[PDB]
């Protein structure tokens, strides 16, 4: 039984070295330490100092050098007794503060234990090297085991989700976070491989190519949906939910992908040093001479949509080699060579559209002097250039019953062209997903286990509308986690008959969510929509209105002291300041019907599907004319949340250890920022308000019997013995609660009992 | 080294309030005997004063860690009576009775909580012994019915430990093969390597019989041997215990018995004290080297 055999790879790579005699009697004294910040500006960089003095409301310790400081006991981050080093769940720590959480992750990472639970979360730190814990032999160990029967592992989360799906006949979701480099793509692959292995029905037919197809969808979706931003070279700018589907007997039957919230604005504008979506650079770098000739291609410097940010390449990334991978993936998921060329023609056409330069003609009317870009776009799109030219500068509308051409000026023509580009790109993205699903989903499912990953909580020096949307999505998903943790905690306290009550943790997020999307009183999105109706509004009247409705009236909002154009929102991950510039423009999403009429007549098979398929195209309207971008956003998010609320969720948090791609180098500043952005610290905050440590009575007595007079180590009535120890030590009863089978302790109290044990043993 | 027994005396004091832990194993001597063996008389003759509770049946209802320390002066102290010096041994007996009743609900049951009594006296050698409840069948007392098992279970907690030397006390005027002390010592120490035998009441044996074969270590062999004693109680003018006369009477007994004269120098209370002091000291010397590290791992 490898789970008990200290010589197995299960023990070598998934358990703490302790074994039995090793980590258990390695001395210990009576000295206590504290975690502190050597430089107050870097709040996530710590060192360990020795406590020296001790007073009423403060401690006194010597910095790692010898200098001295003091800290209000109310703010001190004490270090846990050595017995707590390496625990498999952060909830087992007694001092539950940020540096202590990092320390435990580090004790484990330094022994190559990359998986650690933190309450409901499975935290997975990229080791930046291969560890042999994904073999068939490891799969067999996890098969059918409960989370508390085995060490932390992505296979444990996967198995529990699979058994719950079968036992409860309920779909499951696995919400996984992590920026590129965190190991999220690899962990998601392990989930899929694990499910294919335990739910495989491979005898006779083999396992086919479904797994391979699901994995190959990645390079395609990343090429069109990921981009370099100032904080990550490969940032996902969309959300995706990959359903691994099963038949009624529990065997894998197929998969499906659904995308959400793609950032279409990036196609037409990118901030300094960022890039447009990777596919544009891949195509220009890897197309063959003949493909460049037929698509009228040139270098990225030659296109307005790729030459404004100052950055066209990524250090260490070959866009040409990445294009090769993208095409190979397209072959595997079934795109014909002709469909692939049509996809590239549309990407080329978007670039040519971006190069059209509208000029003021004789009067205000826009005109096109040089028809080069127009003609190149028309050729690759398979449309009539005269029709496209008129649809761009003289789109017709109905004035009463009369068809009238609105002759646009330069600004409106440029804007319409951009709107056409964003529509083409978004529809193309939906068509790619639909085409991939043509091969992934060929049987009606009975159930599914879906993996969700979306853009992570984002903070830049200057944050705009796109960032508020991304962060609002993250806020809603964190409330979803909080609510589920609440339901699970309610059941644990009730099962133990613990005398402590609490309300739905999801309510802690309501103030921020209401600030953003409330309707009554109206939140930010509602006031942005209100300000998008009349021409009297400006970005300045918009922020004045936000300050008027929320400054000093909503605790989660801040009118900054020294900026007239930013407003602050306190999210679970901290405060984010948002710049209002251009929000009114960004909320408008109209597309001229004459442009759709133009493209509906394309001679290209894929272009016609983007404009004739009522699903990919159109949507509806609003009994009016068009839904704002904020209303579209809110609706896609609501659709995603409704899907999640039908499932039983599981949460995985993948972490980058450092930003140098170096193994064995866990950095606190880098790790703590991610734990803050991914909700782990929010889970810890909640955990600290209750009773995190829960100890079976007999185990408490076995360890602490010596701290009280005449209490047998193996006392027959473990509850009375536990009470005798607590009463003799004069523990404040508010710091613990007796349960039917375990004693519950508030943060810090068990560490103090452990410290008393260490002291008593050294005395003896 | 005159320092080993005192060192373990401090450890016993420190563990006196630490409840049972099967892994904690200090080098010490546990006194085991059937209720009829006269084990109280053996201890009172070391001290030279009557100081143990008197009553029918059980005399020790809580383990008594009795630390004897040779001294020029004579007085006693209980660990639970900080700073008090007892010079009247009748008060010592009364305090053992009071402290015992204080803990035991029923006035006849037992408790594992020890009473830690140290006696300084010119009549003793440096020696420590843990007296335990004597064994008996018929619960004849007043609660509980399973008393025999409760006593045996408490005795086993002590003597199943490897560092516990066993002082097995048996009366000569009985069937020594059926000795409760020697039988329980054989259950836990089959090779008879950590059991010291004491044969009491030698002067009470039937006319024409003697315990020579057991005293010579031939009939019921024990590596650490057997020592015979007799309680020939002498009272002084006031009617109180006269140890010098009692020890002289015991000496006269062994010198004049034709079956024991040749062993007299290895019989009697003074010799038994000498033997226990020597064997306990050597045992501590043996076990001390690995002690500190072991304790850390067992606490």
């Amino acid at each position: 039984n490898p789970i008990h055999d200290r010589t197995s790879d299960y023990h070598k790579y998934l358990k703490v070295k302790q074994g039995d005699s090793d980590l258990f009697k390695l001395t210990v004294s009576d000295k206590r330490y504290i975690w502190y910040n050597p430089d107050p500006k870097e709040r996530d960089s710590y060192e360990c100092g020795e406590i020296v003095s001790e007073t009423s409301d403060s401690f006194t310790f010597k910095t790692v050098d010898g200098q001295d400081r003091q800290v209000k006991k109310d703010d001190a981050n004490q270090r846990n007794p050595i017995k707590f080093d390496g625990v498999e769940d952060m909830s087992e720590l007694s001092y539950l503060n940020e540096p202590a959480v990092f320390h435990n992750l580090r004790v484990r990472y330094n022994q190559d234990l990359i998986y650690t639970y933190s309450g409901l979360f499975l935290v997975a730190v990229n080791p930046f090297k291969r560890i042999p814990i994904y073999t068939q032999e490891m799969v067999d160990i996890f098969k059918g085991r409960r989370r508390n029967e085995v060490a932390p592992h992505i296979f444990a989360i996967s198995d529990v989700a699979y058994r719950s799906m079968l036992d409860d006949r309920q779909n499951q979701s696995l919400l996984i976070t992590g920026e590129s480099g965190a190991g999220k793509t690899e962990n998601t692959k392990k989930v899929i491989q694990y499910l294919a292995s335990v739910a495989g029905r491979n005898q006779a037919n083999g396992s086919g190519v479904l797994e391979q197809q699901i994995l190959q969808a990645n390079p395609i979706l990343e090429a069109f949906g990921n981009a370099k931003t100032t904080r990550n070279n490969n940032s996902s700018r969309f959300g995706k939910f990959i359903e691994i589907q099963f038949n009624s007997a529990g065997f894998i039957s197929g998969a499906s992908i659904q995308s959400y919230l793609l950032e279409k604005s990036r196609v037409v504008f990118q901030s300094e040093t960022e890039r447009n979506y990777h596919i544009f650079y891949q195509l220009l770098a890897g197309a063959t001479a003949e493909e460049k000739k037929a698509l009228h291609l040139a270098g990225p410097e030659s296109f307005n949509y790729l030459n404004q940010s100052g950055c066209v390449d990524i250090k260490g990334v070959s866009d040409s080699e990445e294009f090769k991978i993208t095409r190979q993936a397209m072959d595997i998921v079934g795109f014909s060579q002709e469909e692939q060329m049509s996809i590239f023609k549309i990407i080329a056409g978007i670039l040519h559209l971006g190069n059209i330069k509208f000029e003021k003609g004789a009067g205000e009317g826009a005109v096109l002097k040089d028809k080069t870009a127009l003609n190149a776009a028309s050729t690759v799109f398979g449309v009539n250039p005269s029709v496209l030219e008129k649809a761009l500068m003289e789109p017709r509308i109905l004035a009463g019953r009369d068809l009238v051409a609105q002759h646009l000026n330069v600004e409106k023509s440029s804007s319409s062209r951009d709107a056409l580009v964003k529509a083409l790109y978004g529809r193309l993205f939906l068509w790619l997903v639909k085409k991939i699903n043509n091969v992934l989903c060929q049987e009606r499912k009975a159930y599914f286990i879906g993996v969700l990953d979306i853009s992570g909580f984002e903070i830049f020096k200057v944050n705009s509308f796109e960032q508020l949307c991304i962060n609002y999505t993250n806020e809603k998903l964190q409330q979803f986690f909080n609510h589920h943790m609440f339901k699970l905690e309610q059941e644990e306290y009730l099962k133990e008959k613990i005398n402590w009550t609490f309300i739905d943790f999801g309510l802690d997020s309501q103030a921020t969510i209401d600030l953003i999307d409330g309707r009554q009183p109206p939140g930010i999105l509602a006031l942005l929509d209100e300000q998008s109706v009349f021409p009297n509004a400006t970005d300045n009247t918009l922020i004045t209105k936000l300050h008027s409705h929320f400054s000093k009236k909503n605790a989660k909002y801040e009118e900054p002291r020294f900026s007239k154009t930013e407003f602050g929102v306190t999210h679970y991950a901290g405060q984010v300041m948002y710049e209002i510039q251009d929000w009114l423009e960004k909320n408008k999403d109209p597309l001229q019907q004459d442009l759709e009429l133009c493209f509906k007549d394309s001679s290209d098979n894929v272009v016609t599907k983007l404009f004739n398929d009522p699903n990919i195209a159109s949507r509806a309207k609003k009994g009016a004319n068009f839904i704002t971008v904020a209303a579209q956003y809110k609706e896609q998010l609501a659709s995603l949340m409704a899907t999640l609320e039908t499932t039983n969720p599981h949460f995985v948090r993948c972490i980058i250890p450092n930003n140098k791609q170096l193994p064995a180098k866990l950095e606190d500043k880098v790790v703590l920022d991610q734990l803050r952005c991914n909700g782990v610290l929010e889970g810890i905050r909640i955990t600290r308000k209750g009773f995190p440590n829960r100890i079976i009575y007999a185990d408490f007595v076995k360890r602490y019997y010596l701290l009280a007079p005449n209490v047998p180590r193996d006392a027959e009535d473990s509850q009375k013995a536990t009470d005798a120890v607590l009463k003799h030590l004069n523990i404040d009863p508010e710091q613990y609660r007796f349960g039917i089978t375990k004693i519950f302790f508030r943060a810090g109290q068990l560490a103090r009992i452990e410290e008393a044990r260490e002291q008593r043993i050294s005395e003896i | 080294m005159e320092d080993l027994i005192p060192l373990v005396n401090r450890l016993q004091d420190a563990f006196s309030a630490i409840g049972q832990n099967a892994d904690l194993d200090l080098p010490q001597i546990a006194v085991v005997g059937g209720q009829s063996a006269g084990k109280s008389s053996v201890l009172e003759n070391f001290v030279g004063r009557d100081f143990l509770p008197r009553g029918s049946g059980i005399v020790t209802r809580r383990p008594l860690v009795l630390q004897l320390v040779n001294s020029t002066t004579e007085y006693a102290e209980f660990l639970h009576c900080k700073g008090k010096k007892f010079t009247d041994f009748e008060e010592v007996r009364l305090e053992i009775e009071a402290e015992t009743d204080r803990v035991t609900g029923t006035n006849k049951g037992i408790s594992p909580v020890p009473i830690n009594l140290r006696v300084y006296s010119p009549h003793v050698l440096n020696l420590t012994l843990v007296d335990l409840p004597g064994m008996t069948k018929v619960p004849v007392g007043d609660q509980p019915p399973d008393i025999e098992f409760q006593i045996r279970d408490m005795l086993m907690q002590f003597v199943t430990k490897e560092n516990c030397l066993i002082l097995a006390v048996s009366p000569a005027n009985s069937d020594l093969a059926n000795s409760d002390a020697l039988k329980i010592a054989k259950e836990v120490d089959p090779q008879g390597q950590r059991t010291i035998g004491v044969i009491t009441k030698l002067d009470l044996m039937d006319e024409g019989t003697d315990a020579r074969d057991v005293l010579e270590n031939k009939l019921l062999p024990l590596r650490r041997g057997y020592i015979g004693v007799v309680n020939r109680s002498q009272k002084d003018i006031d009617g109180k215990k006269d140890i010098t006369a009692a020890l002289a009477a015991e000496r006269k007994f062994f010198l004049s018995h034709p079956s024991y004269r040749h062993l007299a120098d290895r019989m009697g209370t003074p010799y038994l004290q000498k033997v226990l002091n020597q064997q306990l000291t050597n045992h501590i010397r043996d076990t001390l080297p690995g002690l500190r590290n072991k304790l850390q791992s067992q606490l």
Partner: peptide, 6 residues
């Protein structure tokens, strides 16, 4: 433990 000389 400190009661026991090492």
């Amino acid at each position: 433990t400190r009661l026991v000389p090492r």
